[PDB]
């Protein structure tokens, strides 16, 4: 890419693309999707630390880090083969 344009600058390294993880897939479905989208990690949600409510100013890092989406499952499975204990 270069070789000699720049002489190097502040620091030397410019970071590759970090995250992995938001800037793509899912979306916010409430205000914006294929750009800048902090999703919830405790549930599924999908908003930005701007687009919750008067008042979603504090960033962790990354996405925002989960509201109270309130998804208490009650039809989930999981490998509910058998009936061992004793609750339909
Ligand atoms: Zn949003
Ligand atoms: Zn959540």
């Known amino acids: 890419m270069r070789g000699s ?5 502040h620091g030397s390294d410019i970071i590759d693309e970090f995250g992995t993880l938001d800037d793509s897939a899912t979306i916010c479905r409430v205000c914006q999707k294929p750009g800048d989208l902090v999703m919830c990690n405790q549930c599924e ?3 930005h630390l ?8 504090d960033v962790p890092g990354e996405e925002w880090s989960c ?3 309130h998804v208490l499952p ?3 499975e999981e490998d509910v083969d058998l009936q061992a ?3 339909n």
Do not use: R, T, W
């Open 5 to 9: 344009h720049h002489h190097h600058h």
């Open 50 to 57: 701007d687009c919750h409510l008067p008042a979603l100013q």
């Open 74 to 76: 009650d039809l989930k």
């Open 67 to 69: 509201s109270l989406c």
């Open 45 to 47: 949600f999908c908003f």
């Open 85 to 87: 204990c004793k609750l």
